[PDB]
Amino acid sequence: IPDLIDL
Amino acid sequence: IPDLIDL
Amino acid sequence: DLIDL
Amino acid sequence: LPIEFTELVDLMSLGISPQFLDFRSTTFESDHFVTVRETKDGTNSVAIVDLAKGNEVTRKNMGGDSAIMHPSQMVISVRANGTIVQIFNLETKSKLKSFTLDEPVIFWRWLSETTLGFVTARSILTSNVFDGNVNAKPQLLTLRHANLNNTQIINFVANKNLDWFAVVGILQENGRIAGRIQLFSKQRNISQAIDGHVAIFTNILLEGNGSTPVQVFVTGNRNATTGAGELRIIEIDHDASLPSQYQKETTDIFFPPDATNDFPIAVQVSEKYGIIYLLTKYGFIHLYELETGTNLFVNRITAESVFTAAPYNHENGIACINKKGQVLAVEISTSQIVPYILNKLSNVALALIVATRGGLPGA
């Protein structure tokens, strides 16, 4: 699943 | 269930 | 009971 | 006089809209960070306020609709679709956890530095977030019991040993807020239903016990039928090597007649000084001495509704957030507490108890 936040 | 703590 | 409350 | 009362930050001053300054969107796991979930034109975002760096604000879009910070580290936990949880270290960029729960999360909070707690519609779970098993689901602690039925879950607390737990729900009953607590002992695998709005597990050094604290559970209640407030303090899990036991204590919590819908919203304790800080939703601060349960002080620090709170200043005080976005802190004055007890409470014995426990001046 896509990361819920992109760091 | 309503948001009781914020009433 | 677990505790006196 | 016996307390220091300060403002840590004004959240509206940082540009946070009032619609997000409430229990739904703003979390306060410790005095280190305030996290506000926001939404704009369908897009979610997080404003992370770092109280340890001059209220520096990190603003990032995110895919989830709920986010909390770790008590001390730059570790964010994010949730989407009720069940999907991801946990990231903001410095190293590493993903610590990524899993899907069986049921939607309706409440979460850090229980300790190691362990994150979850409450669903029917279950109570914990995750060892730093154990390196990225995809491991939270472990079931216990099923919720019937006493939490039809409540809004507002807290989940544990002792440092992570073998005693309490989950707090509130419900409206005959136009007053009643509080229900599920207390759970992991060692006996047994729960007990008690009445209470607030709860914390803490420790106290008693004379005779050297450097070893005994454990106590502190809980505050307001009887939804009579209006009577009650604070209780009771020992848990006494080590038989320690000769001194904590004697159970019960004290009144006073509510004026016209504070009809008020109730305890938070309780924090200074272990070092043996001070209980109890806050109500209407913003009344109450101080009690931990050993005796004695009522020390009562005042009002805000007329705006409080919705959450945390320990302040190495856990020696309490900080809270109100619906105007003010983050307020109270802690005892170390130089004035003993004089106040001595002169204003006229209580020489209590003054000595406090002075001796804290290494404080004035006695």
Author numbering:
A (entry chain G), B (entry chain M): 1 to 7
C (entry chain E): 3 to 7
D (entry chain A): 4 to 366
What are the paper's exact sentences on this?
The protein that gives the process its name, Clathrin, is a triskelion composed of three heavy chains (Clathrin Heavy Chain, Chc) that provide the structural backbone of the lattice, further stabilized and regulated by three light chains (Clathrin Light Chain, Clc). The proximal domain specifically interacts with Clcs, whereas, the N-terminal domain (NTD) of Chc, which adopts a WD40 beta-propeller structure, is pivotal for interactions with various adaptor proteins (APs). To investigate the existence of binding sites present in Clathrin NTD, we crystallized the N-terminal domain of Chc with different peptides derived from adaptor proteins containing CBMs. All our structures show that each peptide binds to three different binding pockets (Clathrin, Arrestin and W-box).
Crystal structure of Chc-NTD (displayed as a grey cartoon) bound to CBMs from Ent1 (1.75 Å, red), Ent2 (1.74 Å, yellow), Ent5 (Ent5.1 LIDL motif, 2.01 Å, green), Apl2.1 (Apl2.1 LLDLF motif, 2.75 Å, blue) and Yap1801 (1.95 Å, grey). In the Clathrin box; K63 and K96 establish salt bridges with position +3 of the motif. While these interactions are consistently observed in all peptides, an exception is noted for Ent5.1, where no density for the Asp residues at positions +5 and +6 is observed. Additionally, K98 interacts with position −2 of the motif as observed in the Ent5.1, Apl2.1 and Yap1801 complexes. Concurrently, K326 forms hydrogen bonds with the peptide backbone at positions +2, +4 and +1 for the Ent5.1, Apl2.1 and Yap1801 complexes. We find that yeast epsin Ent5 has the highest affinity for clathrin, highlighting its key role in cellular trafficking. The CBM showing the highest affinity for NTD, belongs to Ent5 and is characterized by the presence of negative charges surrounding the core motif. To gain further insight into the different binding sites of Chc, we performed native mass spectrometry (native MS) experiments on Ent5.1 CBM, the strongest binder of the evaluated peptides. At experimentally suitable concentrations (up to 100 µM), we observed the appearance of Chc bound to three peptides and, although in much lower amounts, a fourth binding event was also detected. Therefore, Chc has (at least) two sets of binding sites with different binding affinities and/or Ent5.1 binds in a cooperative manner.
